[PDB]
Write a protein that binds this ligand. Structure first.
Ligand code: NA
Ligand code: NA
Ligand SMILES: [Zn+2]
Length: 264
């Protein structure tokens, strides 16, 4: 063919992971309206752009809540709608609600790459070879990232970190670390400020030096935490936006894995 399969994609970890699985094969574009995956709701335009694509790929029913309820066979469409984490077992929001933030655990990015290739290679049978090997490398350089880093986080310099929202729960757990998010699983679940007072002392108790913000401006509520008791601000990417740059997906995961481990 002289085109490829037109493929729409919810947000970055998906963008990057379909693109890595496809290599040079398909027309992979991202819903790229822009805003923030947790609170984002597709315009009539994006909806029509989905129904217009050959393939649409999202992360999970627990994140992109519109997606279930996309109705191609009714709205006269022929999209393959693909939930890339389908089957993947998600941890419950602690103590109904589940943490979607898989992609940040190198192993789990790996498993999601696979699912992608599988579903892609049933939909576009010819290119099964290209998908399964692109994914295969991916999972391989992911298992290697886990290996490079397991010792880093072993040597500790103690455990705990605090991030702008609750995104690193899966990373942290794969590495013996424990995290605290200023916000809940989504950035719009902001503290209280009774919660703010607790997290304030958590910084003290567990003796934490850097609060990790994002660019993604909407945490003054973090800024104002150096700007209270304690000190120290550094930015840590949950990969919900794309940084663009050139870097691969795993290259960006690794880069923020640097930052976090270097902080010890
Ligand atoms: Na479908
Ligand atoms: Na092929
Ligand atoms: Zn998030």
């Amino acid at each position: 063919t002289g085109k490829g399969m037109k493929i729409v994609t919810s947000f970055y970890p998906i963008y990057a992971m379909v693109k890595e699985v496809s290599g040079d094969l398909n027309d992979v574009r991202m819903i790229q309206s822009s805003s923030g995956i947790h609170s984002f709701e597709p315009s009539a335009n994006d909806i029509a752009a989905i129904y217009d694509a050959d393939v649409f790929v999202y992360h999970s029913h627990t994140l992109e809540s519109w997606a279930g309820s996309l109705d191609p066979n009714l709205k006269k469409s022929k999209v393959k709608v693909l939930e890339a984490s389908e089957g993947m077992t998600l941890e419950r929001v602690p103590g109904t609600l589940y943490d979607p933030h898989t992609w940040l655990d190198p192993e789990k990015a790996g498993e999601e790459a696979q699912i992608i290739a599988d579903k892609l290679s049933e939909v576009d049978s010819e290119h099964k070879e290209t998908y399964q090997k692109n994914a295969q490398a991916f999972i391989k350089k992911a298992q290697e990232l886990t290996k490079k880093f397991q010792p880093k986080f072993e040597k500790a310099t103690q455990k705990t970190f605090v991030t702008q929202h609750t995104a690193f729960s899966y990373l942290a757990k794969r590495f013996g670390l424990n995290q605290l998010g200023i916000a809940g699983i989504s950035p719009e679940q902001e503290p209280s400020p009774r919660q703010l007072t607790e997290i304030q002392e958590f910084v003290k108790t567990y003796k934490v030096k850097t609060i990790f913000t994002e660019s993604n401006a909407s945490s003054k509520v973090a800024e104002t935490l150096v700007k209270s008791t304690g000190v120290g601000l550094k930015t840590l990417n949950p990969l919900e936006s794309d940084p663009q740059n050139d870097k691969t997906y795993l290259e960006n995961l690794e880069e923020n894995m640097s930052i976090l481990a270097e902080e010890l």
